[PDB]
Amino acid sequence: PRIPVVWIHGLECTCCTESFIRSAHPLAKDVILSLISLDYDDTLMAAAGTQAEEVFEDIITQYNGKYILAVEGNPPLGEQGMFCISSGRPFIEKLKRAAAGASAIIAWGTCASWGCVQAARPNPTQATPIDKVITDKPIIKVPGCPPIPDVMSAIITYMVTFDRLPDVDRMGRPLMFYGQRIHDKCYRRAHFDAGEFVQSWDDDAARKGYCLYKMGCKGPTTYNACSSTRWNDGVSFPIQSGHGCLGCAENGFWDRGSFYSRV
Amino acid sequence: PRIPVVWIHGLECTCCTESFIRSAHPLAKDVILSLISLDYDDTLMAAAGTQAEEVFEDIITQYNGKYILAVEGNPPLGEQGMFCISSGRPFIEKLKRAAAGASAIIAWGTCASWGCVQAARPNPTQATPIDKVITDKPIIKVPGCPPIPDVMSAIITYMVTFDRLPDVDRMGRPLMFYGQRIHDKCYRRAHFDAGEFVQSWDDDAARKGYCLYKMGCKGPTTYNACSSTRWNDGVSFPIQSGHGCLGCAENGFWDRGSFYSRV
Amino acid sequence: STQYETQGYTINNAGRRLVVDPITRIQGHMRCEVNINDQNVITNAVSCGTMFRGLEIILQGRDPRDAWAFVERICGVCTGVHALASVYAIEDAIGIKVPDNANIIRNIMLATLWCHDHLVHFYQLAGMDWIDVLDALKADPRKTSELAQSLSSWPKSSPGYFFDVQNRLKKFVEGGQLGIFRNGYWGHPQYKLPPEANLMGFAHYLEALDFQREIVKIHAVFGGKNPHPNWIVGGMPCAINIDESGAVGAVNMERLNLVQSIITRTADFINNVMIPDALAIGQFNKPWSEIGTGLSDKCVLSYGAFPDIANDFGEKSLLMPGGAVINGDFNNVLPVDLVDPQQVQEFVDHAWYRYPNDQVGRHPFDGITDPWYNPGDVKGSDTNIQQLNEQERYSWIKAPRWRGNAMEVGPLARTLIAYHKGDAATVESVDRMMSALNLPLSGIQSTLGRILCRAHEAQWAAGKLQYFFDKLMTNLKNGNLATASTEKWEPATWPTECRGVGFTEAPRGALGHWAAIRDGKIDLYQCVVPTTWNASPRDPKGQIGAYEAALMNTKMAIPEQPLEILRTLHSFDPCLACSTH
Amino acid sequence: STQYETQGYTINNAGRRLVVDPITRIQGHMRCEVNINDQNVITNAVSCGTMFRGLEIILQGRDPRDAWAFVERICGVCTGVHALASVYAIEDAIGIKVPDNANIIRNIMLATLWCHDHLVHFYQLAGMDWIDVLDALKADPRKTSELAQSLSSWPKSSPGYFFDVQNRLKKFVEGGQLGIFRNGYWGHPQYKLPPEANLMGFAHYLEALDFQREIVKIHAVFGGKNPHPNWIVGGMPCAINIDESGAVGAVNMERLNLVQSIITRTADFINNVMIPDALAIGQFNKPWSEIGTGLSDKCVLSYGAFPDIANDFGEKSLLMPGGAVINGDFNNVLPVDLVDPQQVQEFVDHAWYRYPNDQVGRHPFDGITDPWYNPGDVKGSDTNIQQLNEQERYSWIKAPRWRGNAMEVGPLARTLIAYHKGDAATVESVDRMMSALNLPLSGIQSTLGRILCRAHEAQWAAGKLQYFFDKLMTNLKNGNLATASTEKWEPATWPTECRGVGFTEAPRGALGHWAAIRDGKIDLYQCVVPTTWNASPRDPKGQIGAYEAALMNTKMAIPEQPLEILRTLHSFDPCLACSTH
Ligand SMILES: CCCCCCCCCCCCO[C@@H]1O[C@H](CO)[C@@H](O[C@H]2O[C@H](CO)[C@@H](O)[C@H](O)[C@H]2O)[C@H](O)[C@H]1O
Ligand code: SF4
Numbered sequence A, B: 001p002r003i004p005v006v007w008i009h010g011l012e013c014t015c016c017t018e019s020f021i022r023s024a025h026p027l028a029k030d031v032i033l034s035l036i037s038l039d040y041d042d043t044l045m046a047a048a049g050t051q052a053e054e055v056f057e058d059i060i061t062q063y064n065g066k067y068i069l070a071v072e073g074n075p076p077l078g079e080q081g082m083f084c085i086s087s088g089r090p091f092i093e094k095l096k097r098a099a100a101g102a103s104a105i106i107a108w109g110t111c112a113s114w115g116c117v118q119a120a121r122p123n124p125t126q127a128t129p130i131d132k133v134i135t136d137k138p139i140i141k142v143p144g145c146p147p148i149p150d151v152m153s154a155i156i157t158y159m160v161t162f163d164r165l166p167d168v169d170r171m172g173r174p175l176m177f178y179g180q181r182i183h184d185k186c187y188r189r190a191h192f193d194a195g196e197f198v199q200s201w202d203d204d205a206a207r208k209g210y211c212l213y214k215m216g217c218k219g220p221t222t223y224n225a226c227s228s229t230r231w232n233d234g235v236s237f238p239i240q241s242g243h244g245c246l247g248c249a250e251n252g253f254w255d256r257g258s259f260y261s262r263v
Numbered sequence C, D: 001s002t003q004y005e006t007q008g009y010t011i012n013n014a015g016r017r018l019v020v021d022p023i024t025r026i027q028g029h030m031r032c033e034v035n036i037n038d039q040n041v042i043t044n045a046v047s048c049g050t051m052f053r054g055l056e057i058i059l060q061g062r063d064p065r066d067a068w069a070f071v072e073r074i075c076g077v078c079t080g081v082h083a084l085a086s087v088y089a090i091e092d093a094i095g096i097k098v099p100d101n102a103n104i105i106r107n108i109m110l111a112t113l114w115c116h117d118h119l120v121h122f123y124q125l126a127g128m129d130w131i132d133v134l135d136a137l138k139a140d141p142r143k144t145s146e147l148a149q150s151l152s153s154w155p156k157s158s159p160g161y162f163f164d165v166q167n168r169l170k171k172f173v174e175g176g177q178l179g180i181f182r183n184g185y186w187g188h189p190q191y192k193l194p195p196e197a198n199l200m201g202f203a204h205y206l207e208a209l210d211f212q213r214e215i216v217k218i219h220a221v222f223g224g225k226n227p228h229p230n231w232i233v234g235g236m237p238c239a240i241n242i243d244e245s246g247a248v249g250a251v252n253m254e255r256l257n258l259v260q261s262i263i264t265r266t267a268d269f270i271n272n273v274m275i276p277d278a279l280a281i282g283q284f285n286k287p288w289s290e291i292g293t294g295l296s297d298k299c300v301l302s303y304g305a306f307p308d309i310a311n312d313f314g315e316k317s318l319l320m321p322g323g324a325v326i327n328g329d330f331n332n333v334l335p336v337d338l339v340d341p342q343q344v345q346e347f348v349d350h351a352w353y354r355y356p357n358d359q360v361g362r363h364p365f366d367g368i369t370d371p372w373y374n375p376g377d378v379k380g381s382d383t384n385i386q387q388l389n390e391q392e393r394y395s396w397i398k399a400p401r402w403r404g405n406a407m408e409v410g411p412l413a414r415t416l417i418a419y420h421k422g423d424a425a426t427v428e429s430v431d432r433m434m435s436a437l438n439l440p441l442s443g444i445q446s447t448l449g450r451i452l453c454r455a456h457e458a459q460w461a462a463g464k465l466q467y468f469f470d471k472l473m474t475n476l477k478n479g480n481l482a483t484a485s486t487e488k489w490e491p492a493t494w495p496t497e498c499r500g501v502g503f504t505e506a507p508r509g510a511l512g513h514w515a516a517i518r519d520g521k522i523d524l525y526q527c528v529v530p531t532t533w534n535a536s537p538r539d540p541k542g543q544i545g546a547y548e549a550a551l552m553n554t555k556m557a558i559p560e561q562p563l564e565i566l567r568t569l570h571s572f573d574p575c576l577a578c579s580t581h
């Protein structure tokens, strides 16, 4: 038997599910067919409505204490929770029921970890990260908007293979991928050290791959794996394609000033 | 019709041919079938012996002045050239005949560009790079032992697409891929800057990806694209996998001291 | 219960009420309710968006140059399209013209998204409405091979391959851990494919799940990452260097070679896997050419997209045509103006928002996003909706109208607009397709037609990828490398007060962003998104939107198993995060 | 002319002389000459290595820790194997024991190379000797599909696929630019495949050319790059970090996931493309089970490889067995000792080198590499050779012997040794292969058998990749992460004088490096490489090596077209840069 997994969605854009399906190794196909039992997932499952409600209830009952809960998105506390409605009731009710039976929770993305765009000023819905609502369960934060595909799949394979949760930092992020800053492993650091900066888009510096610090790069304050693991089967990352890091793996990055203002 | 290409081999290990067939984009299959006419190549061609000599003669005669000559390896001047024998005669005779009809010459690899391992002290065969024998043709040097697969194919596509030779530095190397040093685009530069070095293999610093300068890395003196483009469809490069750069794209790198002595 | 007439429909909420909440195999959160009569035919349909985040509110006070990054996060499925509409809007407000290569690259980004999004929709979202996955276990692998080889030149067709797929599925199911297939609608009488077609389709589902990850490598080259690539106001940040020192730090020939390789593979997959599968769905499900017409024979809308002349958004530039048809009059395709206050307006009389006067519609430059959760009597409580009250406010989605008309947007709308404007390629394609199915042209105005049009748009976009790539390469060969205009990057160069509109055709239909800038900051930012149109609630005249109309008059075989509802809703590719933003 | 008898052959150099120079579809530079009688039968064969670089000379005075990097450049085809033999030799000399994970990774590197090298050889080097590429133009695509599907579960088999491949070939030759196919041996009577099998084989040639690039990604993860990955004395430089800060700078779970993905794909391709093709060549070319036997029924040699117990090179550790057979006595597999001066010796009486006494052999610890180009009384001249003089010195390849016996090495040799030692997997594999062909076991001792054994070994190595990967993961789960031993890294820790042997089984056969260290520097470094054995010239007793023996007694259909010579030579996978170093 494969380990049961329940994947639920609060307020979210679905970037985290989309990132997951981009995994190159293992393919998401192979994760679903061979590594886990993805037993509930609104984006992909056949059942709808009452049939989907039956799946949810059956799984969390049969596998009480034994399933992993993956959470994408977050609960809004405004309007009695009815900014996010599932089966006619506040999403937070579904979150709390799913959490109660879980052995552990994976908070995918900056939404579930910290709040992400809906929690940016002035947070109209009172969107709230998972760990401020669920306070009696192990929560692994895997931040990023979205996290890197092959990071998501590596964390999953670690847990399956090694039968344990990843070691985490003081914020609940896996040390393996979040222990160092973007700027600690950035291939443009030679230029940063030399004072060789892009000053305006498409200037001569930009065409030579100079450092993006003066264009607002938030790599110096951001912990993630983008500058080493890279994105989309190692093809690129934001800085390699010419835009500074936005800071998207960090709590509150939307409200830390303009993306084009220097750290 | 596709542009005729004659690819000859002197003293060599065939690492440059092997690198070429690793190309991810375009695939070497598509280069051969659709981009160029690979009209002579000892490694891949059906004909042998007198039939291969007939191909060589026919191509360089029918397409005199119109073919590109690719050279892998180099000619030995020792023993009247008979350290490398082709059709019972010194290889250098074949090189000179091929060169005389070529519009331009691509010197693949450190062997053809500079000399590589057979030219390292004491150079028993008096192995000599192409540009010291052929003095009346354009020669593009594409160094490395071997050069990066996707660099080789990008240079080919550039030439076919744009119908011109790449612009070169003072040493004949294409500026596009050889204009900057490994160490100018190395993702471990943050560690170099901070004085954070591997001191012995598999120490705690090595397990965190610290800089390899004190382990002998020659990235500071080496021009190539390995730290940006990387190797084998962007999977890795020497430093990323934990070994310092050997300096393999630079003239005389074998004789610049131990690989484990600091630059 | 009450009944009234609108748009040729009799809206009757007598009879049994059915609820489908959650709708799955969509993006985001939706609830649907219907009433069925004694013949199990839908006589009332209610579309409800069950989420809201408030991006229009969050964007206030931001620097316009940052806006794209925020609004990109409206949706990770249609990722990039909102960034594109944002940079368009801000450039329109300030008066910025981008260089040709930036426009070409943006067009590549959009075409890449069309290919990716349409492919994943067809297989991962809509496919299990048409393919009975469990019935694939009954297939003969040799007959499956024969079927596949009769439909396509695609290489992967051996009997051994189909046996291996079937065996993997058997072993997946055998331990009772059915995962995403648990408690599905398998065996419903509306599943009409033979077992061999189900196994072929399931094999292709898995191939598409693997292959889709490759398409977005184009976004990674030009935009850094997918989902959610990066953009700039003034062009793109992916500086180009082909033949100078430091090309290792830029988009160089190796990077462009990677892009070309992906384009070729993408076109091959779409043309030889998705296109024959879509035509086969049509061949085996012809009655669905008469189901789910909705507003597609009445009122359809496109803004147009893919400007081929940089900075020119007019009819001679847009490669994907714009226009509107109303009152079923396809002989008169009307021009669309997104500044005209009498054209696009949004109503909230049936939505959870406050206007000063909810009986009037507001153009987006006059838009207001003041959330007000107020469901009235829902036969439960405010935190327990048992039955939405469609006589009152019932959705987080605003109700857009065009000159007061309820419109359908998306692939079928676009196809009808292009066809009736006389686009020769569209006319030829559509006519050839309907001839091959032995159906009349009207058969396209249906649930089945939506699926067919989506597949043909994926083919169109894959072709346009090559066209745009070749355009970029032509410029590079001519020494034209520019990717950004920075003359008006600095806020001191901007008008003190200005406004602009950015528009395009997202995978799901007509998208617009309306932006007003004052004193260097966003003063107003209003979005009207394709699913906002299609999933719209009612207006003050009681007019119904595209989803509600397409569900009307539909027969259900088994009321408790809402496969017909799912088929029609999925044919629009609902994106609920987009619809509500 | 002269005639003499050796090893059951009558070596007769009367009659017509044929020369093949250059030999193509090999690595490096080779010349072959033969004499043929009136009956078109070879009565004399002469193997000549026509290149030399002098790595053994270049290594003198270097730091032992650097040696691997120099000797890896002996060969870019068998890239990595010389680095492995080198670190083994230096570790043996100094007394270094590597950690288990380093050993496992080295075994993965070697198995990866076996898979890659054997696949490319089968298709790109040897394939065109068996597949008539131009005859593929006459195939029926449907019959090609039916053939492929009868032989394999491989998915890529549709009639449309084979038609597309055939049409690509048709287009390729339509302009008269036949490229690598120009002036080939197409239509020779020894091409025996039907057109459909030629088209199947050609399709697979192209699939293999594409796929081989993926295999070596394993080398890129652990070794940085391929060709020519990196290594260290003491283990490997690819430090592991799975669960600690900074894993982004090391071999982490994502890197190991990439390796696993490649292993699976590699096994799938070998098992479902190469193995059925090898068997198909067998089925259609059974007479070649009786041609090219050479020394394979007389004397065969393996050193053994793939130590499963780290730092233990004995019989209980090596997964690929070692041993020697002489005198055709396969009942007596003899143990090999690479330190014993009476076992491995090299002769130069027929090679271009100086020894103090050229009538005796020198063990590699007493080896001398003093090049001396002296072809003597050739037809032609010393810079314009028309005929080598095989009664005098005729090659840059030294002549290795084992206890004075001339031996064959490589896949067939290893298979015979393992079979006759009773290795259960080898016996089962060989028996099932020969039963499928309805051939006796003796049919493996032939040119066809070399090809079959090479394919068997690719399958064996692909399986061992998974075994080694799982062993690595088991260690990581147990918290055993070490990849390097550094207590004897520094030269001051080494013995003042020491010597060592490093040995393995390269794709082409038994490889040894013999190293002597004195005062921190290489004092002697002698290599004996598999093609040195097989392509060997004669010795003082006139004994012939494996290539010369395999060519003896071969019938040629057309003397001017050396297809039978090429078939047999290519069956050994000659690597002439390796042979001469
Ligand atoms: C989409 C996919 C989402 C990811 C799928 C992942 C598969 C996961 C396998 C995880 C295996 C580890 O599982 C984890 O084990 C630890 C013990 O090690 C448990 O830990 C629990 O018991 C231990 C005692 O053992 C206590 O100290 C701890 O406080 C408690 O939470 C977690 O409740 C459980 O979740
Ligand atoms: S581009 Fe950003 S992360 Fe990289 S060196 Fe510059 S500031 Fe640091």
Ligand code: SF4
Residues within 6 Å of the ligand: B182, B183, B184, B186, B187, B188, B189, B190, B192, B210, B211, B212, B213, B217, B218, B219, B220, B239, B244, B245
């Ligand atoms: S590892 Fe080498 S190239 Fe990289 S920063 Fe250190 S010295 Fe420079």
Ligand code: SF3
Residues within 6 Å of the ligand: A012, A013, A014, A015, A016, A017, A072, A073, A108, A109, A110, A111, A112, A116, A117, A144, A145, A146, A147, C073, C076
């Ligand atoms: Fe990733 S669902 Fe997309 S918004 Fe930022 S993580 Fe959330």
Ligand code: SF3
Residues within 6 Å of the ligand: B012, B013, B014, B015, B016, B017, B072, B073, B108, B109, B110, B111, B112, B116, B117, B144, B145, B146, B147, D073, D076
């Ligand atoms: Fe590349 S053939 Fe291999 S040795 Fe260094 S380049 Fe030469």
Ligand code: F3S
Residues within 6 Å of the ligand: A144, A145, A182, A222, A223, A224, A226, A227, A237, A238, A239, A244, A245, A246, A247, A248, A249, C225
């Ligand atoms: S914006 Fe996000 S994706 Fe990586 S480079 Fe910065 S953490």
Ligand code: F3S
Residues within 6 Å of the ligand: B144, B145, B182, B222, B223, B224, B226, B227, B237, B238, B239, B244, B245, B246, B247, B248, B249, D225
């Ligand atoms: S050794 Fe060579 S391969 Fe690149 S990293 Fe250094 S130039």
Ligand SMILES: [Cl-]
Residues within 6 Å of the ligand: A007, A008, A009, A010, A042
């Ligand atoms: Cl959910």
Ligand SMILES: [Cl-]
Residues within 6 Å of the ligand: A110, A114, A115, A116, A117, A119, A250, A251, A252, A253, A254
């Ligand atoms: Cl946040």
Ligand SMILES: [Cl-]
Residues within 6 Å of the ligand: B007, B008, B009, B010, B042
């Ligand atoms: Cl040559």
Ligand SMILES: [Cl-]
Residues within 6 Å of the ligand: B110, B114, B115, B116, B117, B119, B250, B251, B252, B253, B254
């Ligand atoms: Cl050199």
Ligand SMILES: [Mg+2]
Residues within 6 Å of the ligand: C056, C398, C526, C527, C528, C529, C581
């Ligand atoms: Mg809006």
Ligand SMILES: [Mg+2]
Residues within 6 Å of the ligand: D056, D398, D526, D527, D528, D529, D581
């Ligand atoms: Mg030797």
